[PDB]
Design a protein around this ligand. Structure first.
Ligand SMILES: Nc1nc2c(ncn2[C@@H]2O[C@H](COP(=O)(O)OP(=O)(O)O)[C@@H](O)[C@H]2O)c(=O)[nH]1
Ligand code: ALF
Ligand SMILES: [Mg+2]
Lengths: 196, 326
């Protein structure tokens, strides 16, 4: 982004020579393609905020080629759904054209998804986000082989997806809300190529 | 029941490691004479490098010498090679230290160099180099042995996680010390499991200093940002969070001369220890989004003072007990 040299020498600057010199999460439309990066975000949210809005967006946009709307309405829009999301007073009453409805649920989750991506970004910089190691190591990768990169992303996602599964006793006191999330995340990851 | 995991946190240079030493001194194996000696080569290394920075500060900040004769003393010091094997490890042998003592004593009494130290708020420098530069006498002796206070005032950047064990008040403490720098925080997450308590340290002395990772961010500003992320972490909803406003001795003497508006453009109060310190404490407790459920146990400490650390830690243990074995 642009670097600058220090004016006066600091006594312990050489102790952090390779630690110095630091837009991957600006929009969901950007990270929704990266499986590994998403698992870093998906963790932060699932753990700190309410997985509703974010998962909803992912399962929603997952549509693009039927029965999906069946399970979708049963996990997010259902008045009694586990991962209930705050929907507009408009469609709440009103419950092909399916297009308008899905689109109308996503837009209401924009402010929430946007506000969590920012929170992640903030933490990112301060170094208060998990998996920064694997995340960074997956960045300094050179190669004339494109398809090979995407290949390792899938394996990384697997490692994280499992690490987030085995140990998930922090999502919420609810012993069931956690099953819904892992499952939801599970399903979407499978849409990218992550083995389960 | 009787298994306690405590995490020492905070931004860089807040005093975390100074605390461990206090713990070791008041609870574990207090520093044997041979143990203290190990701190000698590092103390000589704080002195010589600290000065290197001052002399560079003088020329850079354009501070006229108080004696042009000391310019030849300045060169001798700049000549010192810091990338050499032992010097790289932050160590300096007695044989060589004694080879610079003459230029250091002279450059230290110079008026120009002094004015540089007074303007330290413009460049990275540990204010503990002053305690040694004033004791060049006890350090210039043949076989010098760091005193109990010298060890505590000694500086050494910490990287990675450092675990420590000890028994106090029939409780088995598992105390972990980490590095505060931005690049060092990623390594923190490997310790957010089953935390019984967290002691977040803050340095009151740097509301006028900048970070060393980017010479353009208020240290105190980072401390607040770091505290707002920890204190509100879902991992610590049931964890006792103690806040240590450290370096009260250096602050109490700091407010008098340099103003506090250098950190809080809105502070309309006065430059008093009592009034300013009370202002900062609110700056932090306010970051608490769960003021109803989550409780913050603030304290004003002086990590280098053993007696104070022993008093404050006893009040911290009584809190840990009431919040768990009730
Ligand atoms: N004068 C004074 N020195 C302190 C205080 N707390 C720590 N120190 C010293 O300041 C430096 C920074 O301490 P350190 O523990 O290394 O900070 P850490 O990086 O957070 O571990 C060391 O030189 C310590 O001797 C304090 O309250 N007053
Ligand atoms: F500056 Al540190 F431990 F945070 F040495
Ligand atoms: Mg330390």
């Amino acid at each position: 982004p642009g670097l600058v040299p220090v004016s006066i020498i600091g006594a312990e600057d050489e102790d952090f020579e390779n630690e110095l010199e630091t837009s991957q999460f600006q929009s969901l439309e950007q990270v929704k393609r990266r499986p590994a990066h998403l698992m870093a975000l998906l963790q932060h949210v699932a753990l700190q905020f309410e997985p509703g809005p974010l998962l909803c967006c992912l399962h929603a946009d997952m549509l693009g080629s039927k029965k999906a709307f069946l399970d979708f309405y049963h996990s997010f829009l259902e008045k009694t759904a586990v991962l209930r999301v705050p929907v507009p007073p408009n469609v709440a009453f009103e419950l092909d054209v399916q297009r308008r409805f899905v689109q109308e649920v996503v837009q209401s989750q924009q402010v929430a998804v946007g506000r969590q991506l920012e929170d992640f970004r903030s933490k990112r910089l301060m170094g208060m986000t998990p998996w920064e190691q694997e995340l960074a190591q997956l960045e300094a990768w050179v190669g004339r082989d494109r398809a090979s990169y995407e290949a390792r992303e899938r394996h990384v996602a697997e490692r994280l997806l499992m690490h987030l599964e085995e140990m998930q006793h922090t999502i919420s006191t609810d012993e069931e809300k956690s099953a819904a999330v892992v499952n939801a995340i599970g399903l979407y990851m499978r849409h990218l190529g992550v083995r389960t | 029941a009787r298994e306690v995991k405590l995490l020492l946190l905070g931004a860089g240079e807040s005093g975390k490691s100074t605390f461990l030493k206090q713990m070791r001194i008041i609870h574990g194996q207090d520093f044997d004479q041979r143990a203290r000696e190990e701190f000698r080569p590092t103390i000589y290394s704080n002195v010589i490098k600290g000065m290197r920075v001052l002399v560079d500060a003088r020329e850079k900040l354009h501070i006229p010498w108080g004696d042009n004769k000391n310019q030849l003393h300045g060169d001798k010091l700049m000549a010192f090679d810091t990338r050499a094997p032992m010097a790289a490890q932050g160590m300096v042998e007695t044989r060589v230290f004694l080879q610079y003592l003459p230029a250091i004593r002279a450059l230290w009494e110079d008026s120009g160099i002094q004015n540089a130290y007074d303007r330290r708020r413009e460049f990275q420098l540990g204010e503990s180099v002053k305690y040694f530069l004033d004791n060049l006498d006890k350090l210039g002796v043949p076989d010098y042995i760091p005193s109990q206070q010298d060890i505590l005032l000694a500086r050494r950047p910490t990287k990675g996680i450092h675990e420590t064990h000890f028994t106090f008040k029939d409780l088995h403490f598992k105390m972990f010390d980490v590095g505060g720098q931005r690049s060092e925080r990623k390594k923190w997450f490997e310790c957010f499991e089953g935390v019984t308590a967290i002691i977040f340290c803050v340095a009151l002395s740097d509301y006028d200093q900048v970070l060393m990772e980017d010479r353009q961010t208020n240290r105190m500003h980072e401390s607040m940002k770091l505290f707002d992320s920890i204190c509100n972490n879902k991992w610590f909803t049931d964890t006792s969070i103690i806040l240590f406003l450290n370096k009260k001795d250096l602050f109490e003497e700091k407010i008098k001369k340099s103003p506090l508006t250098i950190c809080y453009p809105e502070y309309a109060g006065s430059n008093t220890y009592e009034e300013a310190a009370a202002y900062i404490q609110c700056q932090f407790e306010d970051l608490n989004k769960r003021k109803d459920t989550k409780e913050i146990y603030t304290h004003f400490t002086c990590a280098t003072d053993t007696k104070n650390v022993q008093f404050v830690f006893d009040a911290v243990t009584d809190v840990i007990i009431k919040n768990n074995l009730k």
